[PDB]
Write a protein that binds this ligand. Structure first.
Ligand SMILES: [K+]
Ligand SMILES: [K+]
Ligand SMILES: [K+]
Ligand SMILES: [K+]
Ligand SMILES: [K+]
Ligand SMILES: [K+]
Ligand SMILES: [K+]
Ligand SMILES: [K+]
Ligand SMILES: [K+]
Ligand SMILES: [K+]
Ligand SMILES: [K+]
Ligand SMILES: [K+]
Ligand SMILES: [K+]
Ligand SMILES: [Mg+2]
Ligand SMILES: [Mg+2]
Ligand SMILES: [Mg+2]
Ligand SMILES: [Mg+2]
Ligand SMILES: [Mg+2]
Ligand SMILES: [Mg+2]
Ligand SMILES: [Mg+2]
Ligand SMILES: [Mg+2]
Ligand SMILES: [Mg+2]
Ligand SMILES: [Mg+2]
Ligand SMILES: [Mg+2]
Ligand SMILES: [Mg+2]
Ligand SMILES: [Mg+2]
Ligand SMILES: [Mg+2]
Ligand SMILES: [Mg+2]
Ligand SMILES: [Mg+2]
Ligand SMILES: [Mg+2]
Ligand SMILES: [Mg+2]
Ligand SMILES: [Mg+2]
Ligand SMILES: [Mg+2]
Ligand SMILES: [Mg+2]
Ligand SMILES: [Mg+2]
Ligand SMILES: [Mg+2]
Ligand SMILES: [Mg+2]
Ligand SMILES: [Mg+2]
Ligand SMILES: [Mg+2]
Ligand SMILES: [Mg+2]
Ligand SMILES: [Mg+2]
Ligand SMILES: [Mg+2]
Ligand SMILES: [Mg+2]
Ligand SMILES: [Mg+2]
Ligand SMILES: [Mg+2]
Ligand SMILES: [Mg+2]
Ligand SMILES: [Mg+2]
Lengths: 100, 153, 84, 206
RNA sequence: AGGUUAAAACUCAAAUGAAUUGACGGGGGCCCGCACAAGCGGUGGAGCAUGUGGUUUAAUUCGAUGCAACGCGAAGAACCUUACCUGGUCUUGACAUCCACGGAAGUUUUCAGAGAUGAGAAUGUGCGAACCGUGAGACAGGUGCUGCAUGGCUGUCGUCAGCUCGUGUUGUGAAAUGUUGGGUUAAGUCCCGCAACGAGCGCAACCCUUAUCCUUUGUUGCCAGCGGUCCGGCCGGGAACUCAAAGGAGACUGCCAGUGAUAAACUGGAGGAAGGUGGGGAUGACGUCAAGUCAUCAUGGCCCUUACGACCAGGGCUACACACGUGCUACAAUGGCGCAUACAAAGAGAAGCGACCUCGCGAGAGCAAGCGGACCUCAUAAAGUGCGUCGUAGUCCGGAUUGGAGUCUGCAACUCGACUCCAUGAAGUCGGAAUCGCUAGUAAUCGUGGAUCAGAAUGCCACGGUGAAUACGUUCCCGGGCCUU
């Protein structure tokens, strides 16, 4: 991946933590069944004001060694290509070629 | 196959009657591996056939087979020039396999209500040399008749 | 569609734009990129110019446009038929 | 066609892993990324120390790195000075207390990673590729290998049309699983592009 | 009819002989493979999903594109992703290093703007060097070009039985022999012969799994004999059994008979859970297609540098006269619908899986246990079976399309989400030429799980249930192996 595209994910990860608690209580109000009808309205309008990059749904898992946005595997944090290279070098504990 | 390494597989006899002959007929009738659904269809048709005649379920079934079993068939044979449909003797086992397959195929083509009734009407006509299956056995014997000259290829 | 327990959505920057112009006689077209905003029962009258990707197209908000989003009135793709 | 990786196919049979810790899903990905940065640093810092294999363990809230090498005095330095300089960078990277152990690679002519790196350094110095591969093969056969194979691919001698060449002596039975086959690769960055080197070294069935 | 004698201009850099290695033959011989044949079920027709060609478009991003591209890279495009378009913006810079100078970093709010950003306004100032801002110029940056400059990785012939070397010998030589021959094998497998004698890479074996048994261990798993019991392994206990997972045992043509060249081997029998490679997987020789990938990454060269780099909002990748590929659901009675009622395996879970209870027709909601798990949750298996009904009809088949009303995830479902309810009830009644898969727990059929993932499978990967037909044979079609011409 391009350098710029890699730096876009570190920003989105930082902004998702700085506004983490401030985002959760706003949705507590909006999802609150027995709140009122105008603070709900205010909480809805206030959630749109936070930067978009603060929502965790804006993040895209990337290969931690190349930046590849496809073929990701969460257990290793790597794309399918780098998982294979490390597995054959014996750099992933317990991981071997399977056969049953 | 080229190597001829194909033996034989054992087939369990049918529950109600303990006839391996009848158990194969359930297999030919079965679709999608739903064997119990085929066992019921055969048993119902066999009882309608048992009360439509005086014989037991088996003896009425054999009489149906005897009128559908082909004795001689034609197989192609490409030799130096062209291909002739050579009449060949049908081996005893293939006689039963063809008879059952034609019965099940004929009954599936009818227009009665259930398949148990369709199979019953085919097994009954087969006792009287009527309907399809029996006619299919006639068309095969005719073809093998018109090619008797080629009985050495 | 959007859950009823959340109320229709409206982009806050547009909600200020209609407020500052309903109280006044501003009949100038409102230029917005907010195709996701539900049309509310408060701007039946003036013309919002909605973005379609490459320009702003004016829609004259009437009553029967209430409940629809703005984008439903600004088609994004240009089609005229094949070999027509 | 394509061949299976000789190391990977033997990882539970006769070959050991290069990382030997345990973790749940919660930190498995973070341990892999810190092992990567550690090896990335050790390999660059110790480029002239004949580093064959970097084994990483994680006993409990600590990391233990074992550097296999043929020039341990170069790794360690005077009275353990240099090996201490790394024990700090590794702890910085891993974020846990660090401990470095130095293993001895005797007979570097029988280690696939060192042999591959030897040929590769020679190619970057514009040594004739044919001379490098023959020397490597003769050395290992003299020190007692049961077999060795060396393969070199790319624009050999700066030729416009790339090709692959390989030599072999003795036995290299890649289909025998219980065969001790040390295998590694290396890359040379010449003025005409990348040349890849692969080295198989057979040491006897187990 | 023509024969015989017999030129030149012009033109080419060869034409030719014998032999050698291949490849090829509508040449010969001998073999193999779901290659035919024998069978069973599909595709091509319909609706829909999905990919591609084309056309369209501001853009419909790029790549793959006979077999060996076309549910392919993509294990999951609303924003993001995103590489494309339109407009709004930046220039040592979103990402590094170096230096200068300014400042702790951070928190808390106001306006303008779609946002990027700009202008502010508060609070902290702790512990140089953290961390910010600015200023210079070396530089950074490029998913820009070349896979016909490359590394690495992959497809493919093909899991086909082949491919070679040393020394020796033969030939002026290319080369040959070995490696051919007689048998045999799944096998260049093995034996015998032999100007060859040996060796390597392949075959086989070593690895994983499945089928039988033993030993150890006995909870969260187990219940034979006991003892109680609210009949729930529920409790006391029990270590037998099922099972869990460690270590062992077991199959070797070993045994017997015949056959055979006193051989290799083959045919059959015994014992045994298993018999001749037991079943399945992993494992891919020398090489071939300048095959695929400069967009995973790396990299030679080339190119751009106030832009081909960087930031943002909206749009696009979801277009639609059409053509193709791969799928899903059907056309019904071996079925549809209603009620009742059995029997699985494998797996996942902490910003997660989420019981109970209550509310809702329902998707879901509220409340809230338990579980980092043989314990808790996902989580009722469905087909099946019993009883009823429908009675061959475009139907009580089919469920496309459309209207209305909702739920949930998410800043946000207009473009462009999945699911629910009510209504609507399309084509389709078994599919032209043609064409595909499969030899046994297979095909067919029935459900279940997982990766990716906020949400978003008819795809992919995996798991069990039920469970066939047929193989006389090798003339023909396709691909391949060996000898010969
Ligand atoms: K001449
Ligand atoms: K189709
Ligand atoms: K390549
Ligand atoms: K000669
Ligand atoms: K020779
Ligand atoms: K390049
Ligand atoms: K879009
Ligand atoms: K599909
Ligand atoms: K209907
Ligand atoms: K949408
Ligand atoms: K069809
Ligand atoms: K999902
Ligand atoms: K030939
Ligand atoms: Mg890069
Ligand atoms: Mg996402
Ligand atoms: Mg004359
Ligand atoms: Mg056929
Ligand atoms: Mg079709
Ligand atoms: Mg395309
Ligand atoms: Mg292309
Ligand atoms: Mg191809
Ligand atoms: Mg596929
Ligand atoms: Mg987008
Ligand atoms: Mg621009
Ligand atoms: Mg190529
Ligand atoms: Mg000579
Ligand atoms: Mg050969
Ligand atoms: Mg030869
Ligand atoms: Mg021979
Ligand atoms: Mg051999
Ligand atoms: Mg010989
Ligand atoms: Mg093998
Ligand atoms: Mg008792
Ligand atoms: Mg036997
Ligand atoms: Mg392979
Ligand atoms: Mg090419
Ligand atoms: Mg290409
Ligand atoms: Mg490209
Ligand atoms: Mg954007
Ligand atoms: Mg697409
Ligand atoms: Mg219906
Ligand atoms: Mg899941
Ligand atoms: Mg019609
Ligand atoms: Mg009908
Ligand atoms: Mg087969
Ligand atoms: Mg299924
Ligand atoms: Mg052979």
């Amino acid at each position: 991946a391009k350098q710029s595209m890699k730096a876009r994910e570190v920003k989105r990860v930082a902004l998702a933590d700085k506004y983490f608690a401030k985002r959760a209580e706003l949705k507590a109000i909006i999802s609150d069944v027995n709140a009122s009808d105008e603070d709900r309205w205010n909480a809805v309008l206030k959630l749109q004001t936070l930067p978009r990059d603060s929502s965790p749904s804006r993040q895209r898992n990337r290969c931690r060694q190349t930046g590849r946005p496809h073929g990701f595997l969460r257990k290793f944090g790597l794309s399918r290509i780098k998982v294979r290279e490390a597995a054959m070098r014996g750099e992933i504990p317990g991981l071997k070629k399977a056969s049953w | 196959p080229r190597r001829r390494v194909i033996g034989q597989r054992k087939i369990l006899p049918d529950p109600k009657f303990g006839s391996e002959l009848l158990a194969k007929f359930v297999n030919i009738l079965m679709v999608d591996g739903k064997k119990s659904t085929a066992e019921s269809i055969v048993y119902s048709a066999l009882e309608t056939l048992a009360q439509r005649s005086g014989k037991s379920e088996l003896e009425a079934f054999e009489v149906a087979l005897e009128n559908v079993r082909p004795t001689v068939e034609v197989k192609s044979r490409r030799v130096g020039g062209s291909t002739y449909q050579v009449p060949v003797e049908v081996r005893p086992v293939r006689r039963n396999a063809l008879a059952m397959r034609w019965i099940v195929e004929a009954a599936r083509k009818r227009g009665d209500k259930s398949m148990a009734l369709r199979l019953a009407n085919e097994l009954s006509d087969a006792a009287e040399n009527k309907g399809t299956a029996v006619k299919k056995r006639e068309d095969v014997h005719r073809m093998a008749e018109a090619n008797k000259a080629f009985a050495h290829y | 569609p959007r859950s009823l327990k959340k109320g229709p959505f409206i982009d806050l920057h547009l909600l200020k734009k209609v407020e500052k112009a309903v109280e006044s006689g501003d009949k100038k077209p409102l230029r917005t990129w907010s195709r996701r905003s539900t049309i509310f029962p408060n701007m039946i009258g003036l013309t919002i110019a909605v973005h379609n990707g490459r320009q702003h197209v004016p829609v004259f908000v009437t009553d029967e446009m209430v409940g629809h989003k703005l984008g439903e009135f600004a088609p994004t793709r240009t089609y005229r038929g094949h070999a027509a | 066609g394509q061949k299976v990786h000789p190391n990977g196919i033997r990882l539970g049979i006769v070959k050991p892993w290069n990382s030997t810790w345990f973790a749940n899903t919660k930190e498995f990905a973070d341990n892999l990324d810190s092992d990567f940065k550690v090896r990335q640093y050790l390999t660059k810092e110790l480029a002239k120390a004949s580093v064959s294999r970097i084994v990483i363990e994680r006993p409990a809230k600590s990391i233990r790195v074992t550097i296999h090498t043929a020039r341990p005095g170069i790794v360690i330095g005077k009275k353990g000075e240099d090996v201490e300089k790394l024990r700090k960078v590794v702890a910085d990277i891993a974020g846990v207390p660090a401990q470095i152990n130095i293993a001895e690679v005797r007979k570097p002519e029988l280690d696939a990673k060192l042999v591959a790196d030897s040929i590769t350094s020679q190619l970057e110095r514009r040594v004739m590729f044919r001379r490098a591969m023959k020397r490597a093969v003769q050395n290992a056969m003299r020190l007692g290998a049961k077999g060795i194979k060396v393969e070199v691919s790319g624009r050999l001698g700066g030729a416009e049309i790339a090709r692959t060449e390989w030599y072999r002596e003795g036995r290299v039975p890649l289909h025998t699983l219980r065969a001790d086959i040390d295998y590694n690769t290396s890359e040379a960055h010449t003025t005409y592009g990348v040349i890849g080197v692969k080295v198989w070294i057979f040491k006897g069935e187990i």
